[PDB]
């Protein structure tokens, strides 16, 4: 498979009420495994998946160190950004970042990421070539000039090319029994009368991992885009995901309709129908 290690961070200023709130999380694929929340008395980077709990005291010390250094810089960045945009001292602002590596089926760096946003808008991102930056506006252009001056792109690429992948491989091995197991969706179709002549068919995909899935309806083999509702894939709370798609159909014509589900855990695309 094509696995990923990614860290996400949110920093929210609280002006007049103390320090910002920093909440950082880490993921392998769609599975969270660490967090850091600045709102504890002595905040630490903490495990959130069983297969990382085995890392020794030194790992947790270093990842806590890393988190706190990041928070120090995010603090400064929130200050800087308020000045860049000539914003009031009052009022809360949000800074977000994300970074990580994708491991290619060939065992090498397939893709790297390093992106930031301010108040919900793209700010600066590392180009896909991992050599240069893309700045959203004139404020981010100032950040770009500083990061070129410190040759940050090259330094971060070295992290992506080496340790990011090293740690990702180690996680994938230590959690192989869950991380490397594609849980197929359990699927079924339910039937809900809407009137004396129409009914809703709802096609369910439950308990699947990873999150990527497709679920569509067809009528006589043609894609159905009318009379439908699909919900966005959603977490079940146990590490797996759910999705459903519903179509309103004429009563007595249910067997013309087929649900189509594709997922890494299904060897073939699955075609399903309502089964009274």
């Amino acid at each position: 498979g094509s696995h990923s290690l990614r860290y996400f961070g949110t920093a929210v200023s609280r002006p007049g009420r103390g320090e910002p709130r920093f909440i950082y999380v880490g993921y392998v694929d769609d599975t969270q495994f660490v967090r850091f929340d600045s709102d504890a008395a002595s905040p630490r980077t903490e495990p959130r998946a069983p297969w990382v709990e085995q890392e020794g005291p030194e790992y947790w010390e270093e990842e806590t160190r890393r988190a706190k250094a990041r928070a120090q810089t995010d603090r400064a960045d929130l200050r800087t950004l308020r000045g860049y945009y000539n914003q009031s001292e009052a009022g809360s602002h949000t800074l977000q970042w994300m970074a990580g590596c994708d491991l290619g089926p060939n065992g090498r760096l397939l893709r790297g990421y390093h992106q930031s946003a301010y108040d919900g808008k793209d700010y600066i991102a590392l180009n896909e070539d991992l050599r240069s930056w893309i700045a959203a506006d004139m404020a981010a252009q100032n950040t770009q000039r500083k990061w070129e001056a410190t040759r940050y792109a090259e330094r971060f690429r070295a992290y992506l090319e080496g340790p990011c992948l090293e740690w990702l491989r180690r996680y994938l091995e230590n959690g192989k029994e869950t991380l490397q197991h594609a849980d197929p969706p359990k699927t079924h179709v339910t039937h809900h009368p809407v009137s004396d002549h129409e009914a809703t068919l709802r096609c369910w995909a439950l308990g699947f991992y990873p999150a990527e899935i497709t679920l569509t309806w067809q009528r006589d083999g043609e894609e159905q885009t009318q009379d439908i509702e699909f919900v966005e894939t959603r977490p079940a709370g146990d590490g797996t995901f759910q999705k459903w798609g519903a179509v309103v159909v004429p009563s007595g014509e249910e067997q013309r309709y087929t649900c189509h589900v594709q997922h890494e855990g299904l060897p073939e695309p699955l075609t399903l129908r309502w089964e009274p």
Binding site: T73, H114, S116
Partner: peptide, 4 residues
């Protein structure tokens, strides 16, 4: 990064 090391400072925006």
């Amino acid at each position: 990064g090391g400072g925006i």
